[PDB]
C-alpha cells in the first residue's frame, strides 16, 4: 500500500491543492514561551493568528508538524509501549484556517480525505464521529450533510468533571486560543478490547481517535473566562502514525513501515531475538524524540527542557539492557532513524554527526553506574514487603546512579511494584535544603 512517506505528502498535497499554504514545521523547542515544555500541537506556531494579534498573507495553511509530548499538559510518556496508539515524538498532520472556512467546510474536506475513491477511500462504516455536546452544528453537519448514521455520532459534554474540560474541547494551555471540537475515529475491528468514545472502555486500541477538528472560537482567560476570538478559525490535527496504521491494514502504530524498519534496526544494534517487545518499541519511539529534540537545539541536562531529554534518552539505554545490549547502541540509531524519516528527518541529517555524539556521549555517562544501579534496585525488591518502593531507594538510585525517578518506576511497573514518588520528592527537597544549609545561599 501507501508508506508512510506517501501518506504524509498525500495529506500535504490534498490541502494544497485545496488552496492551502504549505508550511514547514516549527521546531520542538517554542519560541520564547516556556511554560510549554516542547511543542505539542501543530497549531502552536499560528497561536498569534488565531487570537488576532498576527496575520498571514494566507488565509489557510496546511502542516506535518513534529511534536513530542513528554511533560506537560500532554504527557504521554508511560503509554510508549503499552498503547498502540501512543508515542513520545509523532507528526501532526494539520489543516489550519484563519478567519477562512468553518465547521462545515473542514467537516468535507476531513471526510473527503478520509473517504473519497480518488484519496483514502476508507470504508464510511468503521468511521465514528464525537461532537461537544453543545455543539448542535457540528452535530446536523455529520448527520444531514454527510450521512452519518445517529448511531455513530456521540456527543461529549464536560466528562474532565469541569466546565469546558472534556474530550470534545480542545484548549491549548491555562489560557490561549481553544474551542469545542469534533473528532474521528476508527474502528480497527472486534478482535480488539475497547468500546466506541464515551464508554467506560473508550481507552481500549479498538476504537482508536484519528483526526482532531478543532473550531477556534475562544481566547481562554488566566480567570477562567471564555472570550470570543475576533474570526471563528478552524485547527486540525491528525497523528500520522496513527492514519498510517489504518491506510496499512495495521491495529498498531508500532506495525507500520516506518515503525518496522527503525524496531528492526534496534534488533541488529541490541542483538535482541523478538519480533516485538516493549523495550523494542520504546527504543524506536525513543530515538525518535531524543534525537529530534538534539537536532533542534536541546541539550541533555540536569534540568528543565534538558532533564526531560535525559530521562527519555537514560530509559532507552535501560530498555537496550533489558535487550542484552553488550555494547553503546542508542547513537547506532540516528542512521537508520533519518533513513525512515524522508522529508521529516532533514533537519537531523543536517545534524547527525552532533547529534550521534551528544547521544553516545550521554550513553557512555550513565553506563558507569546503570548494571550496579540495577543489581541494587534488585536486591532492595528481593526483600520488599508491600507493593512499593520508598522513597529512600528511589533517591539513592537517582542521587549515586544518575535513575531518573520515572525510570525507575518504570522498572519496578513491569513486576507489578509501584514507586512512593511522594517520598522521592521529600527526599529531594530535604538534599536540597542540606545544600542551602550548608552553602548560605
Ligand atoms: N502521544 C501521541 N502519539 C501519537 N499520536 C498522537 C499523540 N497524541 C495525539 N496524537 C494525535 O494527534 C491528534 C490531535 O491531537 P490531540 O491533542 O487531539 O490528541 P488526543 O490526546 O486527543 C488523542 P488520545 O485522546 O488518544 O490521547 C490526535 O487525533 C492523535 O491522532
Ligand atoms: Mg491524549
Ligand atoms: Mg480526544
Ligand atoms: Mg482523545
Ligand atoms: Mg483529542
Redo the contacts with the bound molecule.
Keep these: 500500500s501507501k508508506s508512510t512517506a506517501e501518506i504524509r505528502q498525500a495529506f500535504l498535497d490534498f490541502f494544497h491543492s485545496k488552496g492551502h499554504q504549505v508550511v514547514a514545521s516549527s521546531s520542538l523547542v517554542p519560541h520564547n514561551d516556556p511554560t510549554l515544555l516542547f511543542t505539542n500541537?501543530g497549531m502552536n506556531q499560528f497561536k498569534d493568528v488565531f487570537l488576532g494579534l498576527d496575520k498571514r498573507n494566507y488565509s489557510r495553511a496546511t502542516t506535518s508538524q513534529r511534536?513530542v509530548?513528554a511533560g506537560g499538559k500532554?504527557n504521554?510518556l508511560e503509554?510508549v509501549g503499552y498503547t498502540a496508539?501512543?508515542?513520545?515524538f509523532?507528526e501532526?498532520l494539520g489543516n489550519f484556517s484563519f478567519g477562512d472556512y468553518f465547521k462545515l467546510d473542514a467537516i468535507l474536506f476531513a471526510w473527503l480525505l478520509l473517504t473519497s475513491e480518488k484519496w483514502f477511500a476508507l470504508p464510511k462504516e468503521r468511521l465514528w464521529v464525537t461532537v461537544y455536546e453543545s455543539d448542535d452544528e457540528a452535530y446536523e453537519i455529520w448527520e444531514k450533510e454527510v450521512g452519518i448514521p445517529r448511531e455513530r455520532i456521540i456527543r461529549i459534554g464536560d466528562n474532565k468533571g469541569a466546565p469546558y474540560a472534556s474530550?470534545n474541547f480542545?484548549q491549548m494551555g491555562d489560557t490561549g486560543p481553544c474551542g469545542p471540537c469534533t473528532?474521528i475515529f476508527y474502528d480497527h475491528g472486534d478482535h480488539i478490547w475497547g468500546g466506541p468514545p464515551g464508554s467506560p472502555e473508550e481507552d481500549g486500541d479498538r476504537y482508536?481517535?484519528?483526526?482532531?477538528i478543532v473550531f477556534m472560537q475562544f481566547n481562554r482567560q488566566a480567570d477562567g473566562t471564555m472570550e470570543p476570538l475576533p474570526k471563528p478559525s478552524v485547527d486540525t490535527?491528525?497523528?500520522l502514525?496513527?492514519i498510517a496504521a489504518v491506510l496499512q491494514h495495521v491495529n498498531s502504530?508500532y506495525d507500520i513501515d516506518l515503525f518496522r524498519t527503525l524496531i528492526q534496526a534496534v534488533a541488529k544494534v541490541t542483538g535482541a531475538t523478538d519480533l516485538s517487545n516493549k523495550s523494542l518499541r520504546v527504543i524506536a519511539d525513543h530515538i525518535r524524540s531524543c534525537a529530534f529534540l538534539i537536532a533542534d537545539g536541546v541539550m541533555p541536562s540536569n534540568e528543565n527542557r534538558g532533564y526531560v531529554l535525559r530521562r527519555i534518552i537514560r530509559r532507552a539505554v535501560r530498555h537496550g539492557n533489558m535487550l542484552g545490549a553488550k555494547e553503546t547502541f542508542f547513537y547506532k540509531l540516528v542512521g537508520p532513524l533519518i533513513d525512515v524519516m524522508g522529508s521529516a528527518g532533514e533537519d537531523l541529517k543536517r545534524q547527525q554527526a552532533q547529534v550521534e555524539q551528544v547521544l553516545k556521549t550521554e550513553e557512555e555517562q550513565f553506563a558507569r553506574t546503570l548494571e550496579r544501579g540495577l543489581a541494587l534496585l534488585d536486591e532492595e525488591l528481593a526483600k520488599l514487603s508491600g507493593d512499593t518502593l520508598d522513597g529512600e531507594t528511589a533517591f539513592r538510585l537517582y542521587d549515586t546512579y544518575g535513575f531518573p525517578v520515572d525510570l525507575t518506576a518504570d522498572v519496578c511497573r513491569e513486576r507489578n511494584i509501584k514507586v512512593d514518588e511522594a517520598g522521592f520528592e521529600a527526599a529531594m527537597e530535604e538534599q536540597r535544603r542540606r545544600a542551602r544549609e550548608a552553602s548560605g545561599f
Excluded: K, L, V, Y
Design positions: 500541537a511534536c509530548r500532554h504521554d503509554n496508539r501512543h508515542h513520545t509523532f501532526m474530550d480542545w473528532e482508536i481517535e484519528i483526526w482532531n490535527g491528525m497523528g502514525e496513527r502504530n
